[PDB]
Amino acid sequence: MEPLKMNNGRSIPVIGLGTWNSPPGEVGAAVKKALEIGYRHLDCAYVYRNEAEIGEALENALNSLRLKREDIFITSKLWNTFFRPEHVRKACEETLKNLRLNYLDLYLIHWPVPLKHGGDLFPTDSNGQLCLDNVPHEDTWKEMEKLVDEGLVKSIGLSNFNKRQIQNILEHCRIKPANLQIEIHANFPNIKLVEYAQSVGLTVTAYAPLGNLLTKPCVLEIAHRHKKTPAQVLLRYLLQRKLIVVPKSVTFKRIEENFQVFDFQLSNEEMHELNTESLNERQFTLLQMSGHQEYPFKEEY
């Protein structure tokens, strides 16, 4: 089905390959496999430290599959240690260098919690405490906006921001965020935040869309009824809530399975059942940032 239309007129494919700091050589092969299968959207991040492997696999795949750059949607994310305005540009340029691209389709602020610049990706005490930094969200955003002005990035957005924090960005911005990426799945539907974000015109991407979920009885019943797999039901559930999904995998069979979600429809009763059976508990809490003023998950949503 059809790419989601964003508030700036551009479109984003409703499924993309999620990447992560997987064992060496796995991501490169995953990128190629995904693109062969039909994926046209890759979700990346500086912090996984594998954008160079991705960039190479990507460049070789476009060539062997005879695909054009503009046929693919590429997302990357600005990491917490580069949120100070004077560092944003170089971090983006670095990511683009590694990905071997001239521009990104989408660039997200990875978290609302800045970390000290100039060392490791997770600057840490000898108490094991994270070295926090203080940088207003609107100041980082101003630099993100310049990336759009300059053509280095087509659309900008947010990751792991809460309602309050998004409100503030929208109140100050010249260029609105086009996308919000947050944890969403049947065991954590994140309904209030999703409804809020869509109400102000953002598109919303579910990360960790499979979240044990694959084992839940109602999930299995519904998969059986439709003659699809559990993962396929879990993704369709999110797709029917008008979400983009970026399921992470480096296993060929899973990459392929995740993509076969466009030839059936969950009924209203099935949708409702999944919602009422939800746990619902946040899986990705990053508690080591919980001491920061802008830690996103203490507010209701």
Q: Are 237 and 209 in contact (CB under 8 A)?
A: no
Residue holding tokens 């993509």? 259
What CATH number is given to the structural domain containing 41? 3.20.20.100
Any idea what the Cα angle at residue 144 is, between residues 175 and 94, rounded to 5°?
150
Q: Is the peptide bond between 280 and the residue preceding it cis, with omega within 30 degrees of 0?
A: yes
Helix (H) or strand (E) holding 181: strand 179-183
Return d(Cα 171, Cα 224) in angstroms, integer: 47
Strand 73-78 to 104-109 pairing? parallel
> Which positions make up the binding site?
110
Closest CA to 284 of 200, 185, 194: 185
The residue count for the chain: 301
Dihedral sign of CA atoms 185, 191, 194, 199 in order: positive
Catalytically active residues, by annotation: 48
**Total domains, the chain:** 1
CA-to-CA distance for 245 and 184, rounded, in angstroms? 9
Q: Tell me how far apart the alpha carbons of residues 17 and 239 are, in angstroms, rounded to a whole number.
A: 15
- Give the residue numbers of the binding site for substrate: 110
Range of the domain at 116: 1-301
CA distances to 15, 20, 204, 237 from 199, rounded to whole Å, are: 21, 30, 11, 20
Pairing of strands 203-207, 244-245: parallel
Which residue in 279, 284, 268, 285 sits closest to 213, CA to CA? Answer: 279
Q: In what order do the strands lie in the sheet with 17-18?
A: 17-18, 41-43, 73-78, 104-109, 153-159, 179-183, 203-207, 244-245
d(CA 278, CA 185): 9
Consecutive H or E run containing 34: helix 26-37
CA 294/CA 276 separation, integer angstroms: 31
Q: How far from chain centre, in Å, is Cα 266? A: 24
The SS3 assignment for 4 reads: strand
Residue pair 71/58 in contact (Cβ under 8 Å)? The answer is no
